[PDB]
Specification:
Blueprint: H1 8-18, H2 45-60, H3 62-72, H4 81-89, H5 99-117, H6 122-137, H7 140-145, H8 153-156
């Protein structure tokens, strides 16, 4: 027996729906893909912790996240060919591995709030992204394993202690 990481996404999802579901659960994460759910309390520690860990991150890399999204922007509008690259590039600015998954759920959080708040791309556009995004989310299972499971992020809160100032030669 082993608690698959695909569960942490289950809760993070339900919350991502309420966060925007002012008064009532927002239809931007009501029935992604899973019928007859197993008896479980989607309110564990790691799950909740993530809701935060991710939001907090945005406070630092808020523009970064969205920024990348605008860069790759301009796709077929009907192919995951760009949705996968974006999934990992959405936080490319960072560095860590799993950090791409933490940002994904992070930026996606504020991104949905802004997309819904502003009188544009109503629940129809916000949901659209989720439909495709959620699909890629399932990738975190193995995609996360290679990263080292949340066990690393959802605790020490991502390791950091390196950057220096060497790479180019434009400014002395």
């Amino acid at each position: 027996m082993a608690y698959s990481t695909r569960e942490i996404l289950l809760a993070l999802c339900i919350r991502d729906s309420r966060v925007h579901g002012n008064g009532t659960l927002h239809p931007v994460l009501e029935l992604a893909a899973r019928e007859t759910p197993l008896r479980l309390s989607p309110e564990d520690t790691v799950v909740l912790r993530y809701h935060v860990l991710l939001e907090e991150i945005i406070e630092r890399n808020s523009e970064t996240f969205t920024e990348t999204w605008n860069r790759f922007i301009t796709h077929t509008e009907h192919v995951d060919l760009d949705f996968n690259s974006v999934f990992l590039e959405i936080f490319h600015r960072g560095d860590p591995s799993l950090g791409r998954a933490l940002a994904w759920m992070a930026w996606c959080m504020h991104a949905c709030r802004t997309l819904c708040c502003n009188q544009s791309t109503p629940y129809y556009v916000v949901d659209l992204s989720v439909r495709g995004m959620l699909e890629a989310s399932e990738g975190l299972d193995g995609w996360i394993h290679q990263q080292g499971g949340w066990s690393t992020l959802i605790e020490d809160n991502i390791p950091g202690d390196d950057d220096d100032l060497e790479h180019h030669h434009h400014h002395h």
